Amino acid sequence: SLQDAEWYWGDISREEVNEKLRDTADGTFLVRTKMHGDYTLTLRNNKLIKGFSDPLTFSSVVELINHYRNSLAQYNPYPVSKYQQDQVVKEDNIEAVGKKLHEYNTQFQEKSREYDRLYEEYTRTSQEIQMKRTAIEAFNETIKIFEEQCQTQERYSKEYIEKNEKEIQRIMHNYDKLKSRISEIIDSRRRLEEDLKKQAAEYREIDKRMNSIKPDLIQLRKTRDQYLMWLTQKGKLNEWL
Amino acid sequence: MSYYHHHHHHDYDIPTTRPSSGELWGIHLMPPRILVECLLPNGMIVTLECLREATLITIKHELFKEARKYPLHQLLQDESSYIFVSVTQEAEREEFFDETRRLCDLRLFQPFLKVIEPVGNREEKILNREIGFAIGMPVCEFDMVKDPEVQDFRRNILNVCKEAVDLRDLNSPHSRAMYVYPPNVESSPELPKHIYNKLDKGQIIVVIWVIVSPNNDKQKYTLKINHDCVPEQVIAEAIRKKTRSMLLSSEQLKLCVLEYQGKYILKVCGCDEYFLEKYPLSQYKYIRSCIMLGRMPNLMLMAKESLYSQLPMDCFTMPSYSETSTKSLWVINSALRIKILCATYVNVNIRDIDKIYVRTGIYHGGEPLCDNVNTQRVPCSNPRWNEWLNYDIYIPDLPRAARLCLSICSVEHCPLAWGNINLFDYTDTLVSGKMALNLWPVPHGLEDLLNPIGVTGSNPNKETPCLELEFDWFSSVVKFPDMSVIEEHANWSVSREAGFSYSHAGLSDNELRENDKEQLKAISTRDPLSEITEQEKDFLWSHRHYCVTIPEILPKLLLSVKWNSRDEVAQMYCLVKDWPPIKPEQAMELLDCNYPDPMVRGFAVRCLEKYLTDDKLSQYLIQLVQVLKYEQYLDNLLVRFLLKKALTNQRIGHFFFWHLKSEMHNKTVSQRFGLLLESYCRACGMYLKHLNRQVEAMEKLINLTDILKQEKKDETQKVQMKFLVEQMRRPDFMDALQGFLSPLNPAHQLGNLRLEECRIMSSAKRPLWLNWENPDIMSELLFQNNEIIFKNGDDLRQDMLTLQIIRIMENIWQNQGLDLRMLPYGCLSIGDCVGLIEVVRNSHTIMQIQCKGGLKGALQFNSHTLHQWLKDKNKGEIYDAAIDLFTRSCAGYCVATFILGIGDRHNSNIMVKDDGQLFHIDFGHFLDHKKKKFGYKRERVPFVLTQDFLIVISKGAQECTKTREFERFQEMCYKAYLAIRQHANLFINLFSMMLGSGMPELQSFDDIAYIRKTLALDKTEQEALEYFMKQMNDAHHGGWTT
Ligand SMILES: CCCC(=O)OC[C@H](COP(=O)(O)O[C@@H]1[C@H](O)[C@H](O)[C@@H](OP(=O)(O)O)[C@H](OP(=O)(O)O)[C@H]1O)OC(=O)CCC
């Protein structure tokens, strides 16, 4: 009963345990120098418990477990070990189970590659968007200045034109080189904006297919540590990875 | 040793003798002739045709000769009476006071300038456009910050600044000289046995150079002095060699050495390193390099006045921005209500996903309650909940550092975006009212549901998922208890705990603790990642009063408090109060993310305050800088300790600036780290002017590689090169890339560029191999030329951390007696994937070694040609000598390598130097972060010694597995793996402080957990040795025992 025990994953030190505890929820239990002691219970954030205390009417390693699978409120203020029988598509080859491993493992690799492609595009696009936000305003500022200018142009112009004939002309000229230029810039700030909100758009299409392709990348991931586990329960595992 | 390109002289016996922000918006690097609209104060544009590189002096000058030809001239006055202004990149109207800047260097947005007379009379206080250029965001952008925390940090911190500026000008000029040129000095004065041993019982020959008149004339004086005699003594016996004439009585000789003597101070020939205080001579890193490398130190006799000439004043200014008692938190009589209202902008395929629900928790590093969800109601299309959440934890029991942590999830369970909110604001008020938080996108690593490791604050983005919350209202604002009103709680608890008689878990006059419960000095000794059991936590908590004796147990004890129990936490405060100060290598875990309490971290600082030297501090600066993310508010005790250090020692100042500025682009810290830089730059004095100039080049350098990488690759090296060169001929560049300090080590001046020695390397990422002339008068005696590489496109942060983890391992071994010689070449991340990599001169890739020699008909590598090539470069005992180094370094870059589990060491990322020293370059990703996909257990051997390397280790003959030289080696490796094993805590604590960085191979303590397998910490050394040997024995296909 102790070897089989279902949640007695054996020798798996602190790190094999924790990286078999990452992502299960509450209720989750599983049992593990002798300057320290014997076996450890590791529930769930991770809770290590070394009977635990004086009321050891033992009587077993297992007689302890089913009173606290029945609990631990009453000493201090859910097997999750299910002998890789569940799925692993009962393919009893030791090798069909193994080659399968690779088949999900390239698939996981395949997705992490589309994923990270996407993680970086988001981070890029974010930064192109902000750079487009303080351009839009570097335009608005530019025009403010030109407006301010072409007005001071009329403040001084209609003040020197109490006149005699030449000047008259070639003042209106540069004043009108100025107000076309004001239009020209404005031509640019709507244009940038139309690309801004064009990008602001496709930005979503990234957060969309990220949070669309995260579901997979944990399930596809999960079943791998499912399959991979039915190998090390019975049986070099390098080749399929 | 960065001094001599790590070049051992083997015969020498001492005995037997904003981005995309090119020059213009979009553009990049601006076209060579460019039209500039010049808006006048008479309202007239006039378009000047201007060269790319012209100074606003020439432009102002040309414009007022050209307005002369447009209407309304008499309405303007002399140039003298105006300044140029325009909209810059960062969209802020910059007045252009320095009229010698170039049209290409201003960062203009649109090519137009405007003429104004400069109101704002304090033309002085607007020199701080500097401060803005130095940080790459403009100071005025802070006066635009509404939030009251930031605007408070800005004023409060000024304390520290005046403290520093004061504590400097203390014994002017000497104290300011001590500021700028702080003695570069090893940590032990006690030399190690193997170094002492190259010294014929402790005596160095040193060569003092002197300057009288022209003086392009020099004079050597080769002293041979006791290894540990302070610079003064050296200057003494120096001037003694100089004078002693046949016309000088002995008495009057001694007199002259008295007068003259201290008008001089010692400078290192060939760089800006000075020896300005008492140290045993062998303590300055230079001498102790020179010894290590078989070198004769060259010092230069410096007129002390002529130094106090070269610095002048830093001249500080205090800057331009120069409900009653509330209600005790402990009075609030209820659980915590938190109401998640709606969420705005989640983007998902309505078909592709089932539903979504907001998942929350309260945390303190690791939570204090039964985490909770909230019904999966309105999925996806416009998602509201109106739920209040009932967290079971009474409100008086919230920790100072307690924090709400939420995330929107998909069901099938899957997290979309996460957010963490600080349940207390800085002034101590318990959060209430509306909060619109702004979530972060879930990263690479974390495939978990929440994220307490993450940063606390709203993500700044109009376009991220905004989730809107409501914290309970208590008809008065609520503040966290006074530091006294808690010490009154403790005393109660303690007088209460002393009167029970049943026992339970915390089953604690004179306590029964006798001997047997010396399992306490046991827990103590285990490293951090290694978890604490339930019992152990209760056990510790129950003998808290004892622990003070074994004071370095604290990092555990703390984890043993139930942080949702004021009684416990209120007592744990009173211990921290009079807890023994502890050694830095362990007070530093106290700043990692697992200890977020203020009192705790305050102590961790008091510890540093006491022990850490100015040198240990520059050794762990990254860890220190980086860890700041885990401080809860802006104005915190760590920030303040660091800043004061930055402004006291300008060589810490240097790397504090850069480390901060490196992350400047990183949204999680941009805020924190800008304000801190505004602080540094305002008070560091003259240095700010030096930094502007480094900053000025690194930009030109960014914008050059940036054109090479985009539209410019596809043309053969030859073409690309004859562009890179064309471009650095530009006047604006010659100017900007030529007279500055190396950001890699600021003592190294960079003079004229030398182009024929510049070039683009082979790598896809187009690195720039640049070469500068050393404009030191003793250029010669150190390195006449001086080269560094500039790489744009690699997160350097990793290469950098390994290189820092190699440097530490080295000191560890050596600074203990055990001589392995690693060469952690210098590396600096100066931006987002933009860094500087130091060049080891006289190195070669194994590949070339094998390619430089070995037969005609290209038909397959001769496995002996490494040996051969070495055996060419080193005949003599100069042979026996070079092999020892090759053996001693090979053993080092092997252990370190196996430990940190870095990338595969295939045949052209291992390098060999002429003196026989081998080292690595290009560490791929450490901590085997390619077990991301698979890597279950593995514990791979990255460096695996082929026949090639073995042949060289056993001087020659066949059957190398079995010689003595090999045993010698093996016995080196054992000694070197076991030595690191003794310090593992520091090494975990080191990687721990790094989690804060955005490095994707460092996401969470499980990332670090590798090290604990490599180092076999779960076992006794006895066992580890064997595990290690076995591991070697196996990638080495047998023969690694006896
Ligand atoms: C016949 C001319 C030959 C020549 O030498 O031409 C050289 C330079 C112009 O530089 P460029 O590198 O060709 O221009 C860049 C690229 O073409 C890129 O494809 C483009 O992307 P997108 O516009 O498709 O986005 C960039 O747009 P921005 O985003 O930077 O505006 C663009 O600026 O002119 C001169 O300096 C001399 C002429 C006075």
Ligand SMILES: CCCC(=O)OC[C@H](COP(=O)(O)O[C@@H]1[C@H](O)[C@H](O)[C@@H](OP(=O)(O)O)[C@H](OP(=O)(O)O)[C@H]1O)OC(=O)CCC
């Ligand atoms: C935006 C597109 C990204 C891209 O594909 O860009 C291609 C390159 C730039 O290199 P990279 O991909 O950023 O870098 C990759 C890593 O170094 C990795 O370690 C390695 O795997 P391994 O085999 O050493 O384990 C990869 O090998 P392949 O991926 O070449 O097989 C290597 O490329 O640009 C070019 O010059 C393209 C020329 C066609």
